């Protein structure tokens, strides 16, 4: 009972209405005022609703809040791709010690989008990195959907497992995903082989690009 919870995950398409509930008990939502917060990736939380129902200045009428029993609901109408964010409820709890609660948060995913195949772009080690006796090959993976790829590297057709690091995909500002993968090598490994390849697998389809020092 000194706890707020929310569904971890909600999803809908552009133009739809979606709701997110926050469930508590008599000592918190039952007695106290609920506020809601939006949080974009990287960013500080932003106040969306306060005092159960009120919007601050600057928040659009598409967002509304209500309360009933020991639950509270945020509603978003005319869903936009920009509304993709984490959402949190908060209220004071009057019990015990205790003070301010937040719900565990809800990731709202906006599901407009069609399948798109990744583009793969490779950069060889720079001249400055090689002068510093290192070499990093960079594979940039872009404009894909959905947001799940696997990346493998090859030297001349044989797999290279050691020295690979790949980011978890994140949204580009056009709403498709991008990711990156790095292969660390010695300068002499880089200068020797005929070639190195980044192979990106997405929804059962593999695309690869290939490069070599001679180029």
């Amino acid at each position: 009972q000194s706890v707020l919870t929310q569904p971890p995950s909600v999803s809908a398409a552009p133009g739809q209405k979606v709701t997110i509930s926050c469930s508590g008990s008599s000592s918190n939502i039952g007695k106290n005022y609920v506020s809601w917060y939006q949080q974009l990736p990287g960013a500080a939380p932003k106040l969306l609703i306060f005092d159960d129902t009120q919007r601050p200045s600057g928040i659009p009428d598409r967002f509304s809040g209500s309360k009933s029993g020991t639950s509270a609901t945020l509603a978003i109408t005319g869903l936009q791709t920009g509304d993709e964010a984490d959402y949190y409820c908060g209220t004071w709890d009057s019990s015990l010690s205790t003070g301010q609660l937040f719900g565990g948060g809800t990731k709202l995913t906006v599901l407009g989008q069609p399948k798109a195949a990744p583009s793969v772009t490779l950069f060889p080690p720079s001249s400055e990195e090689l002068q510093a006796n290192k070499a990093t090959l960079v594979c940039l993976i872009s404009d894909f959907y959905p947001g799940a790829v696997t990346v493998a590297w090859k030297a001349d057709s044989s797999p290279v497992k050691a020295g690979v690091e790949t980011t978890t995909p994140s949204k580009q500002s056009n709403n498709k995903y991008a990711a990156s993968s790095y292969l660390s090598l010695t300068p002499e490994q880089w200068k020797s082989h005929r070639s190195y390849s980044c192979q990106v697998t997405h929804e059962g389809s593999t695309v690869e690009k290939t490069m070599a020092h001679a180029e």
Binding site: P45, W92, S97, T98, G99, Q100, L101, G103, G105
Partner: peptide, 27 residues
């Protein structure tokens, strides 16, 4: 003050509440 561990939710740390007239800290 509120904190957030990587990939986790917001966690209140402390502040002034209605009742108790003093700064309160989460347990």
């Amino acid at each position: 003050w509120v904190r957030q561990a990587p990939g986790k939710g917001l966690e209140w740390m402390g502040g002034f509440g209605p009742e108790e007239n003093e700064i309160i800290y989460a347990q």
